[PDB]
Amino acid sequence: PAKKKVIIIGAGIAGLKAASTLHQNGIQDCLVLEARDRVGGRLQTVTGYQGRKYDIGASWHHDTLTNPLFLEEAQLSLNDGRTRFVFDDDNFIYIDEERGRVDHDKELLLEIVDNEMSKFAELEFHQHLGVSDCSFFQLVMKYLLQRRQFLTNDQIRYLPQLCRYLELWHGLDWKLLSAKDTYFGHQGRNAFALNYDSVVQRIAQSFPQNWLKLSCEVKSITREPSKNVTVNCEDGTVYNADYVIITVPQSVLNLSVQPEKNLRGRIEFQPPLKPVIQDAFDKIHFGALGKVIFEFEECCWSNESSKIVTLANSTNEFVEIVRNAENLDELDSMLERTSVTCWSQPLFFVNLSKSTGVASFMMLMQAPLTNHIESIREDKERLFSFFQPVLNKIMKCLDSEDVIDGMRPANKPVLRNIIVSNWTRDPYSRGAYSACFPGDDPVDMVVAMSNGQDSRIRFAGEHTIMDGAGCAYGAWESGRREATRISDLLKL
Amino acid sequence: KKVIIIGAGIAGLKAASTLHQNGIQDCLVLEARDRVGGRLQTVTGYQGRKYDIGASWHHDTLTNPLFLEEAQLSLNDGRTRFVFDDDNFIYIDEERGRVDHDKELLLEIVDNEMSKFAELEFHSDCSFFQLVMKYLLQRRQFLTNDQIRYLPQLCRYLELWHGLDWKLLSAKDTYFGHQGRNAFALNYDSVVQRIAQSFPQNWLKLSCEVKSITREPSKNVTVNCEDGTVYNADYVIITVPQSVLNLSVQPNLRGRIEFQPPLKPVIQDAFDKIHFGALGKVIFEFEECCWSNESSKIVTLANSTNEFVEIVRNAENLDELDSMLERTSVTCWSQPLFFVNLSKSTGVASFMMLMQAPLTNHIESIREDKERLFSFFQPVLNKIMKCLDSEDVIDGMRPENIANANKPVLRNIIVSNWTRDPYSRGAYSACFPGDDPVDMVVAMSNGQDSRIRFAGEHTIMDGAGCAYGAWESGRREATRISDLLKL
Ligand SMILES: Cc1cc2nc3c(=O)[nH]c(=O)nc-3n(C[C@H](O)[C@H](O)[C@H](O)COP(=O)(O)OP(=O)(O)OC[C@H]3O[C@@H](n4cnc5c(N)ncnc54)[C@H](O)[C@@H]3O)c2cc1C
Numbered sequence A: 001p002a003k004k005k006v007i008i009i010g011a012g013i014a015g016l017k018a019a020s021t022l023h024q025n026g027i028q029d030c031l032v033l034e035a036r037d038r039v040g041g042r043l044q045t046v047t048g049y050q051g052r053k054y055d056i057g058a059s060w061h062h063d064t065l066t067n068p069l070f071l072e073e074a075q076l077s078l079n080d081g082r083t084r085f086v087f088d089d090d091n092f093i094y095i096d097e098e099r100g101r102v103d104h105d106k107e108l109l110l111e112i113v114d115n116e117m118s119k120f121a122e123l124e125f126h127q128h129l130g131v132s133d134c135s136f137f138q139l140v141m142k143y144l145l146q147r148r149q150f151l152t153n154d155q156i157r158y159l160p161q162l163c164r165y166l167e168l169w170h171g172l173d174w175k176l177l178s179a180k181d182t183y184f185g186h187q188g189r190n191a192f193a194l195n196y197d198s199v200v201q202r203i204a205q206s207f208p209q210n211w212l213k214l215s216c217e218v219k220s221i222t223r224e225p226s227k228n229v230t231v232n233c234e235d236g237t238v239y240n241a242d243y244v245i246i247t248v249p250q251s252v253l254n255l256s257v258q259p260e261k262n263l264r265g266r267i268e269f270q271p272p273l274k275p276v277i278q279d280a281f282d283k284i285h286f287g288a289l290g291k292v293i294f295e296f297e298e299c300c301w302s303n304e305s306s307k308i309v310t311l312a313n314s315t316n317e318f319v320e321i322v323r324n325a326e327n328l329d330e331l332d333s334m335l336e337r338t339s340v341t342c343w344s345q346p347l348f349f350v351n352l353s354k355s356t357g358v359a360s361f362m363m364l365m366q367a368p369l370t371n372h373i374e375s376i377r378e379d380k381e382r383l384f385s386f387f388q389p390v391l392n393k394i395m396k397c398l399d400s401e402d403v404i405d406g407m408r409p410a411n412k413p414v415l416r417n418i419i420v421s422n423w424t425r426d427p428y429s430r431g432a433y434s435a436c437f438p439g440d441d442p443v444d445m446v447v448a449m450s451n452g453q454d455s456r457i458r459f460a461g462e463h464t465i466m467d468g469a470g471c472a473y474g475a476w477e478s479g480r481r482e483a484t485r486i487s488d489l490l491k492l
Numbered sequence B: 001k002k003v004i005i006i007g008a009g010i011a012g013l014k015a016a017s018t019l020h021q022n023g024i025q026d027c028l029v030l031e032a033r034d035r036v037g038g039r040l041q042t043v044t045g046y047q048g049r050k051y052d053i054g055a056s057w058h059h060d061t062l063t064n065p066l067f068l069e070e071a072q073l074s075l076n077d078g079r080t081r082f083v084f085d086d087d088n089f090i091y092i093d094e095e096r097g098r099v100d101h102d103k104e105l106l107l108e109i110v111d112n113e114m115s116k117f118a119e120l121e122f123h124s125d126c127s128f129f130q131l132v133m134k135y136l137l138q139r140r141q142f143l144t145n146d147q148i149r150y151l152p153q154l155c156r157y158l159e160l161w162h163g164l165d166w167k168l169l170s171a172k173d174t175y176f177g178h179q180g181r182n183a184f185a186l187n188y189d190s191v192v193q194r195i196a197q198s199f200p201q202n203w204l205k206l207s208c209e210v211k212s213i214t215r216e217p218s219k220n221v222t223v224n225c226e227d228g229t230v231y232n233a234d235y236v237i238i239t240v241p242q243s244v245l246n247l248s249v250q251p252n253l254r255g256r257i258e259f260q261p262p263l264k265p266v267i268q269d270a271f272d273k274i275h276f277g278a279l280g281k282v283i284f285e286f287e288e289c290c291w292s293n294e295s296s297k298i299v300t301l302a303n304s305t306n307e308f309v310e311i312v313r314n315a316e317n318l319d320e321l322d323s324m325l326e327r328t329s330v331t332c333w334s335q336p337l338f339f340v341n342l343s344k345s346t347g348v349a350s351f352m353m354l355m356q357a358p359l360t361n362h363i364e365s366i367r368e369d370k371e372r373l374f375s376f377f378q379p380v381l382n383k384i385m386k387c388l389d390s391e392d393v394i395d396g397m398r399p400e401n402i403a404n405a406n407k408p409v410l411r412n413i414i415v416s417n418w419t420r421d422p423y424s425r426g427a428y429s430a431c432f433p434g435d436d437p438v439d440m441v442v443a444m445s446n447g448q449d450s451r452i453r454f455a456g457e458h459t460i461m462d463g464a465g466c467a468y469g470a471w472e473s474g475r476r477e478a479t480r481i482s483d484l485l486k487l
């Protein structure tokens, strides 16, 4: 029954940073137990056509003005002049299947009214009250209704579709998304990590190799009345430590409050997680941001921008319904009055050619599409067939021609490979990250997690902290937080 | 008299409209000028075109109540009273040309970041210029050379929101959120007229320059225009601009009101923590439109230098940045200028150009020298026309050409005069580094005493410096007085 000072479950960035902090503080005899055959967790870099590398999990350093993880990276690059990231924010190109490009349009002025909708939402909630949540969709309808006298038909038709790019930030359809949580305050530009794995490896490299135990799935954690904690890997292995920092995803941890021990990733807690933790799961959920990588032979399209969003189909009928609806109740009725296509929801494409010089498109998708697409990620023919219409429309707007299917080995773009994410089906992630359905209050979880199960059983991860909640750097900071409190306690 | 309203600006006119709406009678509005409207004035130019030489937009249309009242009237009678003219800004540099929506400069994106940096830094108080310098030094590792060069010139469009150069402007008050889009009033004089005739015309007394306001502990206020006539009223609502009112706390100038007793301390102290901006306007009227109507918003950037970059790249800390930086002649390229292309939004062949201090006072001074004015702005006008797929400007101001129908022909220039009008002495409330506009607001909101009140764009928090702000302040003081008397 090997004795350890600290047992960290999960080798994601939280777990990795927690072990880093522990070592950095002189603490010895710690362990990092990871279920998968790799470290990184939701930070994973995959290889595709010709050795091209892509981050299939997180790709950006957000809030570069305050992001501690980013500043740390930025310093290294200032000292050795090595390119670790690239600021790739750009003027968004918006594409409708019909009206073509609708961005920066002298008549539509979509970005302008979008800015107003944003201020409208802020005014709607920033106004401290028992305001009451609703879906993001309902919030946009309420905006259209209140400002219809000041909007053209075209604005009422396309604005709603254009503002849905926010779905790609939460990984949720606007009808499943909480209005109160939709608008986040970006604190500066984003920086595209040129290998998030290099961030993972650098932190992993900061502590004892022998501390890492890969392919070990923790099944249960027990608190001994005799002040200490017992942990069981699935392969018989048993440990007992003074402290444990649990970093498994909110979705995996959620399995704990359910009866059935035979679930890949689920941990049996003894005593079971306190009611404040269990109940918090009813107040926060999990989104499904997913990715699809489209690799072409050569860059043969306009690199006017690295940011392109394809709007879902809209209809003149909708405008009419908005002009004639006498109120929000009636609007929903009139709206209620087939089958999902690549045009049934907005899709977000990153033109990597401009940003990194690679002839590939990194596309983001949201729930429910992500689940369906990830489910057929092996049927490459079906994937191409599904994304062909939009891939073409984009090439059309970027001065190129229809895409050619070259997946089974001049001016025409030829698709070589297609890589799809698998976060919703992977038992050790079960989705992308924490997100809010309407009525959800993310603070309940953050409080319950950061206050721990008890003095010895702690938590870290993107879902356990306010600043950078959902983000890689937030997960990172939570790792540091828990390790610091513990190294201080061990210091005594 | 029941209540005496000093000033026929929108604050004063609303106060009268309200007092009357509340059955109050026997009231007077004493205006020093020979017209009502104050800093709201629509002038007439070439071919009868009309322009607001004073305020021209309804800001914060999401919450602006004056705007909402105007929108209802239009929903009911269908008359156009305004148009939403926000547009994608076109940014023009003398050497480089258009630098907006640039796939490599992406200036709007760093401008936005700069904006967030400003919010973070103030969550002390320098000049907007200094704030911009800190940001440049602190983020240079993530900025390209051209961004370091052009962004600071682009971000200065904010000088036209305040009517103050970036070295005179308080960084703390530079950025201010907008409650939604702006709407161009198609006749602010319509707003003025509607409110003006919503009370007994015989209440209005034009060309009355109130010279002194006296309060006797014997529950009464005595006001007398400088032409000798004296008035005694229960309540007094003073709406003269902050600039004019600031003459009281000093020793005969035109417009100055002699208060007896003097203005309490809290008020006199407030003039120390709040100042006045000088937003100005120049109207360029062309024969007809012969340029591209891509956008209605065009800003010309002051010139920039690569030596400024090297200084940013080389500066050790913030203190040495200054040194290297503190190392003449004024031209149209010495500051950013904001041009509203009226053709796209109103169908009129004219540009409404906005300017700031220190430049405003200088151009208004030579407002009658058409030749001088055309010569000063010619370069930026040609640069604009070029960028808008047109030709250099032809001076057709002297009525007589025949060789046109191809190039833009300037037919007239109209300049504002707010900095030289003794009754406005500037444009509106504005902050210098170190100011705190809240003191003047509270000082004004509470008043000198129960019978010597204040109204005006400078006496309110929401809509501060705006036409609706002034409007609301007029209703405020009005109501409080309506209640007290209807008692
Ligand atoms: C598609 C996608 C795109 C995203 N894009 C960005 C972005 O651009 N920028 C950004 O900042 N964030 C982004 N995020 C979020 C970011 O990836 C996460 O916030 C971060 O990776 C979370 O790290 P973590 O340590 O909190 O959790 P994890 O990375 O999930 O680490 C938890 C670890 O626990 C392990 N584990 C689970 N169960 C067990 C068990 N029973 N026993 C042992 N080990 C177990 C898991 O294998 C995993 O390795 C994105 C996420 C996704 C999925």
Ligand SMILES: Cc1cc2nc3c(=O)[nH]c(=O)nc-3n(C[C@H](O)[C@H](O)[C@H](O)COP(=O)(O)OP(=O)(O)OC[C@H]3O[C@@H](n4cnc5c(N)ncnc54)[C@H](O)[C@@H]3O)c2cc1C
Residues within 6 Å of the ligand: B006, B007, B008, B009, B010, B011, B012, B030, B031, B032, B033, B036, B037, B038, B039, B040, B053, B054, B055, B056, B057, B058, B059, B208, B209, B210, B211, B239, B240, B241, B244, B255, B256, B257, B279, B280, B281, B416, B418, B423, B424, B426, B427, B428, B455, B456, B457, B458, B465, B466, B467, B468, B470
């Ligand atoms: C060039 C310019 C552009 C602007 N653009 C906008 C804009 O787009 N949108 C917006 O909302 N706001 C704008 N503003 C500001 C707006 O015009 C003011 O906020 C508003 O007009 C203030 O109204 P007021 O009643 O408070 O002051 P005023 O209009 O100055 O009324 C005060 C009155 O008192 C009179 N008076 C002065 N002294 C005496 C005296 N001793 N005796 C009797 N009468 C006296 C003055 O003649 C004047 O009529 C702009 C201002 C300027 C100058």
Ligand SMILES: C[C@@H](CCNCCCCN)NC(=O)c1ccccc1
Residues within 6 Å of the ligand: A058, A059, A060, A062, A088, A089, A168, A169, A170, A190, A289, A307, A364, A469, A470, A471
């Ligand atoms: C959709 C999101 C995916 C990666 N970041 C997820 C953050 C989730 C925080 N809750 N990224 C973006 O929206 C984006 C948009 C423009 C440039 C760079 C990134």
Ligand SMILES: C[C@@H](CCNCCCCN)NC(=O)c1ccccc1
Residues within 6 Å of the ligand: B057, B059, B157, B158, B160, B161, B162, B279, B338, B354, B428, B429, B430, B464, B465, B466
């Ligand atoms: C007319 C002036 C705004 C005046 N409104 C009152 C502002 C008070 C700030 N204290 N400027 C603008 O509307 C403007 C708008 C966009 C760019 C530059 C200027």
